[PDB]
Amino acid sequence: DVQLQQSGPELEKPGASVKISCKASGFSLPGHNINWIVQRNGKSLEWIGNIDPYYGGTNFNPKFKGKATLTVDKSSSTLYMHLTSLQSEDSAVYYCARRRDGNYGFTYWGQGTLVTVSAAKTTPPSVYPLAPGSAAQTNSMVTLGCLVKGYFPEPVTVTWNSGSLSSGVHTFPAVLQSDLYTLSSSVTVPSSTWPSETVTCNVAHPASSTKVDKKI
Amino acid sequence: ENVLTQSPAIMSASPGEKVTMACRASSSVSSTYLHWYQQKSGASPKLLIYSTSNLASGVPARFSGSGSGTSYSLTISSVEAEDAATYYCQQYSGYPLTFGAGTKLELKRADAAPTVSIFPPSSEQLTSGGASVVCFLNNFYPKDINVKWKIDGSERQNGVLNSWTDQDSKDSTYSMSSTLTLTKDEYERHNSYTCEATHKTSTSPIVKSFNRNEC
Ligand SMILES: O=C(O)[C@@H]1C[C@]2(C(=O)O)C=C[C@@H](O)[C@@H](C2)O1
């Protein structure tokens, strides 16, 4: 297979250095640049510089110098990035990207490497099940709710029955409600697939070691 | 530097519409390599169009790019609900590589009226603290509403949450949810609570109530 493997998110206080990585895995490494593009919070994209998966090339943006140490180690193939003096607007996501061609604009981008930068304490979610009323409603096909009270930071990932019932998915955003970000997520299940088949909700929150699987 | 601005900031459509936008670039994009990226609601940008005109495998043909040095098209001849996104482009300068601030499309369609439905606020919420009466308004167009509450009567509380969704890729819908947040030391004290929704599809605001039945 091929992939650009990246692992985030890290929440740091203002000052610290998020040691980030990407594993280009699969094509020729010799002739390739993993450009680390950066996407703005509610805004636009822009580019840092790039790093050769073999020798140590760094072509760099005339601004991104100092918060930018892009580096491959020989052995096993991996591309690094290390930003320092993390300040409140680096609070965005990060990418790794790839060449098949001279399409000089990448087909094969990586995952969501996210970074949040703020000095507030971590919170595991408090995932909860909502019941409605034992009733008859609207049109004969039922709506069930799962919500996740305030946690910290975003993200978390809410999921339902993992396969079998990927019903009317709509996951609602969060406000930062004070501190704590808040979620809610929906379904509409056929009134025979539920209650005979329990529908499940599931949540993860990396920076709180969480997994909560909840049954309705 | 070589910087790109591609108005319309936001743009409109209808299934059928021949829609167009422009990667306005500076002087020569030094030999011209133009790439148009569709980012759908918090995701990886995806190449459609790439060595200026070129599209690849994966895309249906709603999509021709083109231009010389300074302007670049993307003919989305016909749109389906999932052309609802942001479309930004990228180039040369003759190194470093700029991108652009992208164009948003919002697919239009004939309106629908909201399905509010209420869920009383959970076993583990109350046993442990407070009550998020959450009410989901699902599958509507045009996204605009006014969702208020009837605390008791139609009491004007504060401390009320909101979340809208993305434009859906199938039905060009939007949906959203509301939460009243309050102490057990108020929820087990006020009796009859309603999410009141107002929208141009009904003459009425729709009012789906509850008063202490279901646990
Ligand atoms: O084609 C690609 O996708 C990428 C981008 C890249 C560049 O310098 O911009 C162009 C050619 C290749 O050397 C590298 C770097 O892979």
Short mmCIF file of C-alpha atoms and ligand atoms in Angstrom, two decimals:
data_model
loop_
_atom_site.label_atom_id
_atom_site.label_comp_id
_atom_site.label_asym_id
_atom_site.label_seq_id
_atom_site.Cartn_x
_atom_site.Cartn_y
_atom_site.Cartn_z
CA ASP A 1 0.00 0.00 0.00
CA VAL A 2 1.07 3.77 0.14
CA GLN A 3 0.40 6.47 2.82
CA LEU A 4 1.90 9.53 4.45
CA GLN A 5 1.48 8.66 8.19
CA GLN A 6 1.25 11.64 10.63
CA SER A 7 0.44 11.65 14.30
CA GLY A 8 -1.17 14.55 16.14
CA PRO A 9 -2.74 16.22 18.21
CA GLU A 10 -0.51 17.78 20.85
CA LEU A 11 -1.77 20.57 23.13
CA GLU A 12 1.11 22.65 24.51
CA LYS A 13 1.31 25.77 26.62
CA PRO A 14 2.71 28.92 24.87
CA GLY A 15 6.57 28.44 24.64
CA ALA A 16 7.05 24.70 24.04
CA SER A 17 8.21 22.69 20.94
CA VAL A 18 5.81 20.24 19.37
CA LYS A 19 8.00 17.45 17.94
CA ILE A 20 5.94 16.32 14.95
CA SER A 21 6.50 13.54 12.36
CA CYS A 22 5.27 12.07 9.10
CA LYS A 23 6.29 8.65 7.66
CA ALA A 24 6.31 8.65 3.90
CA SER A 25 5.65 4.92 3.31
CA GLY A 26 5.72 3.31 -0.03
CA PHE A 27 7.24 4.91 -3.22
CA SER A 28 10.80 5.81 -4.07
CA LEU A 29 12.23 8.04 -1.39
CA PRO A 30 15.21 9.45 -3.74
CA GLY A 31 13.26 12.29 -5.70
CA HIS A 32 10.43 13.39 -3.48
CA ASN A 33 9.74 16.17 -1.14
CA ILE A 34 7.48 16.11 1.77
CA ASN A 35 6.28 19.59 1.90
CA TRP A 36 4.72 20.60 5.13
CA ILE A 37 1.87 22.81 4.22
CA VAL A 38 -0.08 24.60 7.01
CA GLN A 39 -3.82 25.27 7.03
CA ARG A 40 -5.13 28.26 9.01
CA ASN A 41 -7.80 28.16 11.73
CA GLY A 42 -10.97 29.24 9.89
CA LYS A 43 -8.68 30.60 7.07
CA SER A 44 -6.27 29.60 4.18
CA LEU A 45 -3.35 27.44 3.35
CA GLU A 46 0.39 28.38 3.00
CA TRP A 47 3.80 26.52 2.87
CA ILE A 48 6.85 26.09 5.12
CA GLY A 49 9.64 24.46 3.10
CA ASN A 50 10.40 20.86 2.14
CA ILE A 51 12.71 17.95 3.17
CA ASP A 52 14.41 15.32 0.94
CA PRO A 53 13.68 11.69 2.14
CA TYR A 54 17.38 10.60 1.59
CA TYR A 55 19.86 13.56 1.62
CA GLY A 56 18.98 16.70 3.70
CA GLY A 57 17.42 19.23 1.35
CA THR A 58 15.61 22.16 2.72
CA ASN A 59 14.20 24.63 0.27
CA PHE A 60 12.55 27.20 2.78
CA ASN A 61 9.91 30.00 3.02
CA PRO A 62 11.46 33.49 3.65
CA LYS A 63 9.53 33.73 6.92
CA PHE A 64 9.62 30.08 8.01
CA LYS A 65 13.09 29.96 9.28
CA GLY A 66 13.64 29.40 13.09
CA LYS A 67 10.22 27.62 13.80
CA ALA A 68 11.32 25.04 11.20
CA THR A 69 13.62 22.19 11.44
CA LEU A 70 12.35 19.69 8.87
CA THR A 71 14.33 16.40 9.14
CA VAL A 72 14.62 12.86 7.73
CA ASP A 73 16.67 10.22 9.49
CA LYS A 74 18.24 7.55 7.30
CA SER A 75 17.33 4.01 8.64
CA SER A 76 13.59 4.12 8.45
CA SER A 77 12.53 6.75 6.23
CA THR A 78 10.78 9.38 8.51
CA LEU A 79 10.25 13.19 8.02
CA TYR A 80 10.20 15.50 11.03
CA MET A 81 9.23 19.07 11.81
CA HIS A 82 9.99 20.96 15.04
CA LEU A 83 8.53 24.35 15.76
CA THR A 84 9.54 26.37 18.79
CA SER A 85 8.11 29.45 20.51
CA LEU A 86 4.65 28.03 19.96
CA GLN A 87 2.44 30.95 20.13
CA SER A 88 -1.32 31.03 19.91
CA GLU A 89 -1.73 31.20 16.09
CA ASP A 90 0.36 28.09 15.21
CA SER A 91 -2.86 26.58 16.68
CA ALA A 92 -3.89 24.95 13.39
CA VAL A 93 -3.32 21.59 11.49
CA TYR A 94 -0.22 20.31 9.53
CA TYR A 95 0.46 18.18 6.32
CA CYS A 96 2.97 15.91 4.51
CA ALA A 97 2.38 15.58 0.59
CA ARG A 98 3.47 13.56 -2.62
CA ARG A 99 4.83 13.11 -6.11
CA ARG A 100 3.91 10.59 -8.67
CA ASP A 101 4.47 13.24 -11.29
CA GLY A 102 5.28 16.63 -12.51
CA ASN A 103 1.86 17.51 -11.25
CA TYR A 104 3.91 19.97 -8.86
CA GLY A 105 1.01 20.01 -6.52
CA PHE A 106 0.45 17.03 -4.59
CA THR A 107 -1.99 14.15 -5.02
CA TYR A 108 -0.97 12.11 -2.01
CA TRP A 109 -1.32 14.27 1.14
CA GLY A 110 -1.32 12.94 4.64
CA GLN A 111 -3.56 12.90 7.61
CA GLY A 112 -4.73 15.63 10.09
CA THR A 113 -1.78 16.52 12.27
CA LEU A 114 -3.46 18.94 14.68
CA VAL A 115 -1.81 21.28 17.26
CA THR A 116 -3.65 23.38 19.83
CA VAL A 117 -1.44 25.86 21.89
CA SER A 118 -2.92 26.92 25.29
CA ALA A 119 -2.33 26.90 28.91
CA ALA A 120 -5.61 25.26 30.26
CA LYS A 121 -5.99 21.81 32.01
CA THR A 122 -7.10 18.57 30.25
CA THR A 123 -10.50 17.12 30.49
CA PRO A 124 -11.86 13.77 29.58
CA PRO A 125 -15.36 14.01 28.04
CA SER A 126 -18.42 12.91 29.79
CA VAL A 127 -20.22 10.97 27.04
CA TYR A 128 -23.96 10.54 27.74
CA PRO A 129 -27.00 8.75 26.24
CA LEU A 130 -30.31 10.55 25.53
CA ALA A 131 -33.69 8.82 25.43
CA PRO A 132 -36.69 10.77 24.06
CA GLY A 133 -40.07 9.41 25.19
CA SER A 134 -41.67 5.91 24.59
CA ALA A 135 -43.64 7.34 21.54
CA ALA A 136 -45.13 7.87 17.99
CA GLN A 137 -43.58 10.85 16.05
CA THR A 138 -43.44 12.79 12.75
CA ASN A 139 -43.09 9.87 10.32
CA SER A 140 -42.47 6.22 11.46
CA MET A 141 -38.50 6.31 11.65
CA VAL A 142 -36.88 7.18 15.07
CA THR A 143 -34.23 9.70 16.28
CA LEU A 144 -31.79 8.88 19.11
CA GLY A 145 -29.17 11.30 20.56
CA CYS A 146 -25.65 11.07 22.06
CA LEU A 147 -23.87 14.08 23.43
CA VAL A 148 -20.51 14.60 25.14
CA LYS A 149 -20.40 17.30 27.82
CA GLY A 150 -17.40 19.71 28.06
CA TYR A 151 -13.96 18.23 27.51
CA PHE A 152 -10.57 19.83 26.41
CA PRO A 153 -9.07 20.32 23.74
CA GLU A 154 -10.94 19.65 20.48
CA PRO A 155 -10.60 16.84 19.17
CA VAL A 156 -12.56 13.96 20.32
CA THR A 157 -14.20 11.54 17.72
CA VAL A 158 -17.93 10.41 18.22
CA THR A 159 -18.98 7.26 16.28
CA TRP A 160 -22.18 5.09 16.15
CA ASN A 161 -22.43 1.27 15.75
CA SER A 162 -19.16 1.45 13.69
CA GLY A 163 -20.53 -0.31 10.50
CA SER A 164 -24.07 -1.94 10.72
CA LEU A 165 -25.75 1.43 11.31
CA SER A 166 -24.07 4.35 9.86
CA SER A 167 -27.56 5.91 9.82
CA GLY A 168 -28.32 9.75 9.34
CA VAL A 169 -24.94 11.02 10.50
CA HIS A 170 -24.70 14.62 11.41
CA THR A 171 -22.21 15.52 14.03
CA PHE A 172 -22.65 19.00 15.40
CA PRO A 173 -19.65 21.23 16.27
CA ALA A 174 -18.61 22.75 19.49
CA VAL A 175 -18.34 26.15 21.15
CA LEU A 176 -15.44 26.74 23.57
CA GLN A 177 -18.18 27.16 26.18
CA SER A 178 -16.17 28.72 28.98
CA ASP A 179 -13.22 26.54 28.69
CA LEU A 180 -14.44 23.06 27.62
CA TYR A 181 -15.60 22.31 24.16
CA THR A 182 -18.90 20.46 23.87
CA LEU A 183 -20.35 17.94 21.33
CA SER A 184 -23.60 16.21 20.17
CA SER A 185 -24.14 13.73 17.32
CA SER A 186 -27.15 12.22 15.55
CA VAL A 187 -28.86 9.29 13.92
CA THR A 188 -32.34 8.28 12.69
CA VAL A 189 -32.47 4.48 12.98
CA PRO A 190 -35.26 2.22 11.54
CA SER A 191 -37.58 1.40 14.55
CA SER A 192 -36.99 -2.38 14.11
CA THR A 193 -33.20 -2.30 13.75
CA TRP A 194 -33.57 -0.53 17.13
CA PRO A 195 -34.51 -1.88 20.02
CA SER A 196 -33.79 -5.49 18.94
CA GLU A 197 -30.34 -4.41 17.88
CA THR A 198 -28.85 -2.02 20.42
CA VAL A 199 -27.38 0.95 18.60
CA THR A 200 -23.94 1.97 19.90
CA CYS A 201 -22.19 5.44 20.28
CA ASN A 202 -18.39 5.44 20.70
CA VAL A 203 -15.88 8.37 21.56
CA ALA A 204 -12.15 8.81 21.75
CA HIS A 205 -10.15 11.66 23.07
CA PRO A 206 -6.37 11.22 22.60
CA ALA A 207 -5.23 13.83 25.19
CA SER A 208 -7.41 12.16 27.87
CA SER A 209 -6.64 8.47 27.00
CA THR A 210 -10.42 8.03 26.29
CA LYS A 211 -12.61 5.55 24.72
CA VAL A 212 -16.29 5.55 25.84
CA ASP A 213 -18.65 3.16 23.98
CA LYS A 214 -22.27 3.81 25.01
CA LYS A 215 -25.36 1.81 24.28
CA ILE A 216 -28.76 2.81 23.30
CA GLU B 1 6.15 36.67 -4.00
CA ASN B 2 3.24 35.65 -6.46
CA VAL B 3 -0.10 35.93 -4.58
CA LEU B 4 -3.54 34.71 -5.53
CA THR B 5 -6.94 36.07 -4.72
CA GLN B 6 -9.84 34.27 -6.41
CA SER B 7 -13.17 36.08 -5.71
CA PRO B 8 -16.17 35.21 -5.48
CA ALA B 9 -15.47 34.77 -1.75
CA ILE B 10 -18.72 32.81 -1.31
CA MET B 11 -20.62 31.84 -4.51
CA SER B 12 -24.05 30.32 -5.39
CA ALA B 13 -25.60 27.61 -7.69
CA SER B 14 -28.49 25.23 -8.64
CA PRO B 15 -28.07 21.69 -10.16
CA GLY B 16 -27.50 22.53 -13.77
CA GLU B 17 -25.77 25.85 -13.37
CA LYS B 18 -22.60 26.64 -15.36
CA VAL B 19 -20.44 28.10 -12.58
CA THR B 20 -16.95 29.66 -13.03
CA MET B 21 -14.18 31.22 -10.80
CA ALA B 22 -10.63 32.58 -11.43
CA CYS B 23 -7.13 31.83 -9.99
CA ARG B 24 -5.90 35.46 -10.58
CA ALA B 25 -2.13 35.22 -10.40
CA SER B 26 0.77 37.66 -10.68
CA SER B 27 2.39 38.26 -14.13
CA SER B 28 3.65 34.93 -15.42
CA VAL B 29 3.07 32.07 -13.05
CA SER B 30 6.77 31.53 -14.30
CA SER B 31 5.85 28.64 -16.75
CA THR B 32 2.36 28.06 -15.21
CA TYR B 33 1.47 24.98 -13.14
CA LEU B 34 -2.06 25.41 -11.82
CA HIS B 35 -3.73 23.20 -9.28
CA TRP B 36 -7.28 23.35 -8.03
CA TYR B 37 -8.05 21.73 -4.74
CA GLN B 38 -11.49 20.82 -3.31
CA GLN B 39 -11.53 20.76 0.50
CA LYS B 40 -14.79 19.29 1.81
CA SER B 41 -15.54 20.34 5.41
CA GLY B 42 -12.31 19.73 7.38
CA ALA B 43 -10.41 17.42 5.14
CA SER B 44 -7.63 16.77 2.90
CA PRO B 45 -7.65 18.98 -0.23
CA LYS B 46 -7.92 16.78 -3.29
CA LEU B 47 -6.42 17.44 -6.70
CA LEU B 48 -8.93 17.61 -9.49
CA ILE B 49 -7.24 19.86 -11.94
CA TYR B 50 -3.43 20.05 -11.91
CA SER B 51 -0.94 20.97 -14.71
CA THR B 52 -3.25 23.94 -15.32
CA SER B 53 -5.99 22.24 -17.40
CA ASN B 54 -5.38 18.62 -16.67
CA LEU B 55 -7.88 16.66 -14.53
CA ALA B 56 -7.18 13.10 -13.43
CA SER B 57 -8.80 9.82 -12.49
CA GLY B 58 -11.33 10.04 -9.59
CA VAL B 59 -13.26 13.11 -10.85
CA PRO B 60 -16.37 13.22 -12.98
CA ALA B 61 -16.33 15.73 -15.74
CA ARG B 62 -17.98 18.70 -14.29
CA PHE B 63 -14.57 20.34 -14.33
CA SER B 64 -12.36 22.07 -17.04
CA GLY B 65 -9.40 24.34 -16.00
CA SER B 66 -7.34 26.67 -18.30
CA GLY B 67 -5.75 30.12 -18.80
CA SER B 68 -2.25 31.55 -19.58
CA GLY B 69 0.01 33.15 -16.90
CA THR B 70 -2.48 35.37 -15.07
CA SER B 71 -6.07 33.89 -14.93
CA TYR B 72 -7.28 30.29 -14.55
CA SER B 73 -10.76 28.80 -14.87
CA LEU B 74 -12.57 25.87 -13.51
CA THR B 75 -15.79 25.34 -15.42
CA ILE B 76 -18.15 23.46 -13.05
CA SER B 77 -20.74 23.07 -15.82
CA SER B 78 -23.25 21.29 -13.69
CA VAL B 79 -23.16 20.92 -9.82
CA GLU B 80 -24.60 18.11 -7.61
CA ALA B 81 -25.05 18.67 -3.70
CA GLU B 82 -21.36 17.70 -3.37
CA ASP B 83 -19.78 20.46 -5.08
CA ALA B 84 -20.51 22.13 -1.67
CA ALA B 85 -17.01 23.03 -0.38
CA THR B 86 -14.00 25.43 -0.77
CA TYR B 87 -11.82 25.60 -3.93
CA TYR B 88 -8.44 27.16 -3.72
CA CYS B 89 -5.54 27.05 -6.20
CA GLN B 90 -1.68 26.96 -6.09
CA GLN B 91 1.41 27.86 -8.25
CA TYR B 92 5.16 28.79 -8.75
CA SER B 93 6.50 32.30 -8.19
CA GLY B 94 9.63 30.46 -9.45
CA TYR B 95 9.91 29.18 -5.78
CA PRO B 96 8.34 29.77 -2.98
CA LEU B 97 4.95 28.17 -3.48
CA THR B 98 1.98 30.20 -2.55
CA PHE B 99 -1.56 28.94 -2.41
CA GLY B 100 -4.69 31.08 -2.47
CA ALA B 101 -7.65 31.93 -0.42
CA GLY B 102 -10.39 29.75 -1.85
CA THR B 103 -13.86 30.10 -3.21
CA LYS B 104 -16.86 28.63 -1.38
CA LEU B 105 -19.91 27.25 -3.16
CA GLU B 106 -23.32 26.69 -1.35
CA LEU B 107 -25.71 24.43 -3.38
CA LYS B 108 -29.23 25.68 -3.63
CA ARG B 109 -32.42 23.78 -3.64
CA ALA B 110 -36.14 23.97 -3.00
CA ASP B 111 -36.83 24.50 0.80
CA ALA B 112 -37.77 22.05 3.50
CA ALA B 113 -39.27 22.69 7.01
CA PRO B 114 -37.44 21.51 10.19
CA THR B 115 -37.86 18.24 12.11
CA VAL B 116 -37.28 19.22 15.77
CA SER B 117 -37.17 16.25 18.18
CA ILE B 118 -36.43 16.35 21.91
CA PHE B 119 -34.39 14.10 24.16
CA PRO B 120 -34.71 14.54 28.05
CA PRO B 121 -31.34 14.90 29.61
CA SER B 122 -29.89 11.45 30.53
CA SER B 123 -29.38 9.17 33.55
CA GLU B 124 -25.64 9.79 33.97
CA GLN B 125 -26.07 13.54 33.39
CA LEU B 126 -28.42 14.00 36.36
CA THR B 127 -27.02 11.44 38.77
CA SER B 128 -23.79 13.38 38.36
CA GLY B 129 -24.53 17.11 37.84
CA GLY B 130 -26.81 18.91 35.35
CA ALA B 131 -29.00 18.84 32.30
CA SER B 132 -28.31 19.39 28.71
CA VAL B 133 -31.66 19.32 27.12
CA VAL B 134 -30.58 18.94 23.56
CA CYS B 135 -32.91 19.44 20.61
CA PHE B 136 -31.88 18.64 17.07
CA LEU B 137 -33.30 20.39 14.06
CA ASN B 138 -32.51 18.11 11.22
CA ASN B 139 -32.56 18.42 7.47
CA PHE B 140 -33.54 21.90 6.24
CA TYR B 141 -32.93 24.57 3.66
CA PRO B 142 -32.50 27.84 3.87
CA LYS B 143 -30.11 27.80 6.85
CA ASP B 144 -31.60 30.47 9.07
CA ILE B 145 -33.78 29.80 12.09
CA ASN B 146 -34.24 31.31 15.51
CA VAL B 147 -34.16 28.69 18.22
CA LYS B 148 -35.27 29.90 21.56
CA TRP B 149 -36.74 27.95 24.57
CA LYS B 150 -39.86 27.88 26.86
CA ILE B 151 -38.20 27.40 30.22
CA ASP B 152 -41.50 27.62 32.10
CA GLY B 153 -43.99 29.90 30.13
CA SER B 154 -41.21 30.93 27.57
CA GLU B 155 -38.68 32.24 30.24
CA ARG B 156 -35.79 34.06 28.87
CA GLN B 157 -32.85 32.24 30.18
CA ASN B 158 -29.23 32.58 29.03
CA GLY B 159 -26.42 29.83 29.11
CA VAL B 160 -27.78 28.22 25.92
CA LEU B 161 -25.60 26.37 23.35
CA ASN B 162 -25.72 26.02 19.54
CA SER B 163 -23.99 23.98 16.78
CA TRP B 164 -24.79 24.11 12.95
CA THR B 165 -23.59 21.45 10.52
CA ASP B 166 -21.76 21.33 7.17
CA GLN B 167 -23.81 21.51 3.87
CA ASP B 168 -24.74 17.91 3.18
CA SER B 169 -23.41 16.09 0.15
CA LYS B 170 -26.54 14.28 -0.82
CA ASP B 171 -29.48 16.51 0.08
CA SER B 172 -28.06 20.13 0.06
CA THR B 173 -29.22 20.38 3.60
CA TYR B 174 -27.82 21.93 6.77
CA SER B 175 -28.94 20.85 10.30
CA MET B 176 -28.24 22.20 13.84
CA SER B 177 -28.75 21.49 17.59
CA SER B 178 -29.47 23.51 20.85
CA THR B 179 -28.63 22.81 24.54
CA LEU B 180 -30.01 24.48 27.67
CA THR B 181 -27.34 23.99 30.41
CA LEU B 182 -28.53 24.05 34.05
CA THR B 183 -28.09 22.69 37.57
CA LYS B 184 -30.04 19.64 38.89
CA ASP B 185 -30.80 22.50 41.30
CA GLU B 186 -32.92 24.13 38.65
CA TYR B 187 -33.81 21.21 36.23
CA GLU B 188 -35.51 19.31 39.07
CA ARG B 189 -37.39 22.57 39.86
CA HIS B 190 -39.03 24.16 36.76
CA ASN B 191 -41.42 21.48 35.11
CA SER B 192 -42.35 22.26 31.38
CA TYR B 193 -39.55 22.89 28.83
CA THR B 194 -39.86 23.45 24.95
CA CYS B 195 -37.44 24.20 22.09
CA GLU B 196 -39.14 26.84 20.05
CA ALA B 197 -38.03 27.10 16.43
CA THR B 198 -38.99 29.88 13.93
CA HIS B 199 -38.17 29.42 10.09
CA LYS B 200 -39.75 30.77 6.82
CA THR B 201 -41.30 27.34 5.98
CA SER B 202 -44.04 27.49 8.59
CA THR B 203 -46.26 30.21 9.69
CA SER B 204 -45.93 28.95 13.23
CA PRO B 205 -42.77 28.61 15.27
CA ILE B 206 -42.75 24.84 16.01
CA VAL B 207 -42.98 24.02 19.66
CA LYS B 208 -42.18 20.31 20.79
CA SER B 209 -42.72 20.06 24.44
CA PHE B 210 -41.96 18.13 27.49
CA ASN B 211 -42.93 18.22 31.09
CA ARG B 212 -41.53 15.58 33.52
CA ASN B 213 -42.52 12.34 31.61
CA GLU B 214 -39.74 9.91 30.59
CA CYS B 215 -36.70 9.37 32.98
O1 LIG C 1 5.48 16.61 -7.33
C1 LIG C 1 5.19 16.66 -6.13
O2 LIG C 1 4.05 16.32 -5.75
C2 LIG C 1 6.26 17.07 -5.07
C3 LIG C 1 6.54 18.71 -4.99
C4 LIG C 1 7.97 19.12 -5.51
C5 LIG C 1 8.34 20.62 -5.27
O3 LIG C 1 9.50 20.99 -5.10
O4 LIG C 1 7.47 21.48 -5.24
C6 LIG C 1 8.11 18.79 -7.01
C7 LIG C 1 8.82 17.74 -7.46
C8 LIG C 1 9.38 16.76 -6.56
O5 LIG C 1 10.82 16.94 -6.56
C9 LIG C 1 8.91 16.88 -5.11
C10 LIG C 1 8.93 18.32 -4.73
O6 LIG C 1 7.56 16.27 -4.91
#
